[PDB]
Design a protein around this ligand. Structure first.
Ligand SMILES: N=NCC(=O)CC[C@H](N)C(=O)O
Ligand SMILES: [Ca+2]
Ligand SMILES: [Ca+2]
Lengths: 182, 360
């Protein structure tokens, strides 16, 4: 996955998450055509019977979460991220940090994220303090000895009172924000 | 260039070269949909491990004219010959993730290309030729690779050595390093083919015939007729309210929008910012909340053309209340089962709840 976003002068807003699944998808390059083929169908459950079972012509469940936030029915913030099932964690934590904590957009994006889908799967980004990780673990959690980067949020703020767009690219990849004047 | 301001447009992407291409589109009078299409092409070339015309995506668009928000869904579909147990072996055991993720059975009919065209017909403003050509040049002439792509090539060198990628990415057997030129002759040709013929060449043409060919070589059942069957869909957002804001996000076949909204709904009443961002209480509460929503995700989420996702129940304020009883600073919750959102919505599920191994 990668996530990008674009705002224009006419007030159109784009928030676009797109992927080939694993890095390089399957790894299969189409001979003589240079393009990588997705392994998107392993987003299906491997064991059938459930909501996300494989079926012909079916779409494998995604976790992609391209989002636009609105105030008084006008768009004010685009959010999205890569990272598989962590994407939910990256987007809600950004939104939590921006709106519940009132951080600046960059602070909201750069704040260490956690992820845990189950009692047997935990991740955290560097910057969780050591003492707090220990106390979480003593309480029953399973945060490991090694931090990992989680997600890669690109986001645009639409500032109407200052008549301006602000874009931010997460430091987890070499993304950039580039603004345009007339 | 991590933060930027602008009066008349803004672009933010994971690659500096795709950001500039995108900016230039807007600078020459293009709209955001024109810029986005060109960006997807640029990223296909500069960040080729992460997305492109061999995959699929969800493109959310707020239309400045009509004030309507819509999603171009190019998510891939299983071929007509996919079977419910195709990732099980002779013995009925799950095939390990690193095998099944490299196999031809893993390849969905790609949609990205049809997504960009649908989006172009509806809002497009510059000719697709102008949008595609900067990526034709990046492919043809090449560019110096960033660290992330370099690390990506190195970390996946084994997968890449067993395919036709060997020559381009592992030249003379070694992974391209940071700063080394990556040239993609064959990718450039495909983009020229699309530039002259459009998506016919992909879904009803030679590019597609080649895709079906390589998929059978690797063991899957995708035919050319899978490729001509495929069309994108268009979705309305799933909407939610948080902290006085309306939020539009992605519905099924993503789990993303509903569970992001559900997490927000569950944590809202805890007024999380009374705790320091790096506090025990915040991390604990988020961890407990996630356990509940991800369990709900494993039980209830799939393609809504085939299965019923209890969207109404999953976000029902009384359901949120019920689940919030399991979220507390008193202890860690060990009862991390999916809840019962069907209680708060009309109907029953049409599927079992099947536990899956955490092998991905
Ligand atoms: C790269 C992405 O993070 C992969 C996304 C994953 N296949 C999904 O659709 O949720
Ligand atoms: Ca608050
Ligand atoms: Ca980070």
């Amino acid at each position: 996955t990668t996530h990008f976003t674009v705002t224009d002068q006419w007030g159109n807003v784009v928030s676009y998450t797109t992927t080939i699944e694993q890095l390089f998808g399957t790894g299969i390059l189409v001979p003589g055509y240079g393009l990588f083929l997705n392994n998107e169908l392993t987003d299906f459950d491997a064991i059938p019977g459930g909501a996300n079972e494989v079926q012909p012509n079916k779409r494998p469940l995604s976790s992609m979460t391209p989002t636009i936030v609105f105030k008084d029915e006008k768009p004010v913030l685009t959010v999205g991220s890569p990272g598989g099932t962590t994407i939910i964690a990256s987007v809600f934590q950004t939104i939590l940090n921006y709106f519940e904590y009132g951080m600046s957009l960059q602070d909201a994006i750069e704040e260490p994220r956690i992820y845990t889908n189950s009692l047997t799967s935990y991740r955290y980004e560097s910057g969780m303090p050591e003492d707090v990780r220990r106390k979480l673990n003593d309480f029953g959690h399973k945060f490991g000895s090694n931090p990992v980067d989680i997600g890669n949020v690109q986001s645009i703020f639409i500032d109407r009172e200052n008549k301006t767009f602000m874009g931010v690219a997460d430091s987890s990849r070499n993304g950039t924000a580039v603004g345009v004047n007339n | 260039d991590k933060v930027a301001v602008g009066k008349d447009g803004m672009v933010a992407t994971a690659h500096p070269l795709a950001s500039k291409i995108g900016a230039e589109v807007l600078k020459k009078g293009g709209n955001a949909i024109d810029a986005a299409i060109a960006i997807q092409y640029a990223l296909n070339v500069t960040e080729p491990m992460m997305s492109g015309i061999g995959g699929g995506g969800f493109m959310m668009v707020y239309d400045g004219e009509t004030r309507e928000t819509s999603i171009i869904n190019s998510r891939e579909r299983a071929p007509e010959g996919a079977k419910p147990d195709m990732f099980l072996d002779e013995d009925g055991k799950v095939i390990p993730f690193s095998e099944r993720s490299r196999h031809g059975n893993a390849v969905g009919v790609p949609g990205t290309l049809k997504g960009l065209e649908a989006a172009h017909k509806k809002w497009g403003t510059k000719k697709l030729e102008d949008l595609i050509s900067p990526s034709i040049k990046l492919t043809e002439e090449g560019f110096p690779i960033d660290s992330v792509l370099a690390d990506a090539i190195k970390d996946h060198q084994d997968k890449l050595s067993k395919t036709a990628a060997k020559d381009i990415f592992l030249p003379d057997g070694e992974p391209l390093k940071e700063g080394d030129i990556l040239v993609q002759k064959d990718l450039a040709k495909t983009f020229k083919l699309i530039r002259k013929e459009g998506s016919k060449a992909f879904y009803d043409g030679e590019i597609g015939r080649a895709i079906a060919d390589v998929v059978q070589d690797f063991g899957g059942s995708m035919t050319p007729d899978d490729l001509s069957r495929y069309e994108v869909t268009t979705d309305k957002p799933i909407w939610g309210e948080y902290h006085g804001y309306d939020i539009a996000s992605m519905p099924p076949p993503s789990s993303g929008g509903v569970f992001m909204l559900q997490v927000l709904k569950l944590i809202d009443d805890f007024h999380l910012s009374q705790y320091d961002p790096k506090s025990f209480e915040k991390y604990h509460l988020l961890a407990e909340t996630m356990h509940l929503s991800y369990a709900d995700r494993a039980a209830y989420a799939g393609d809504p053309e085939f299965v019923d996702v209890p969207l109404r129940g999953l976000l029902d304020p009384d359901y949120i209340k019920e689940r919030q009883k399991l979220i507390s600073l008193d202890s860690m919750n060990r009862d991390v089962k999916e809840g019962d959102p069907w209680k708060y919505e009309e109907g029953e599920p049409n599927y079992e709840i099947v536990p899956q191994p955490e092998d991905k």
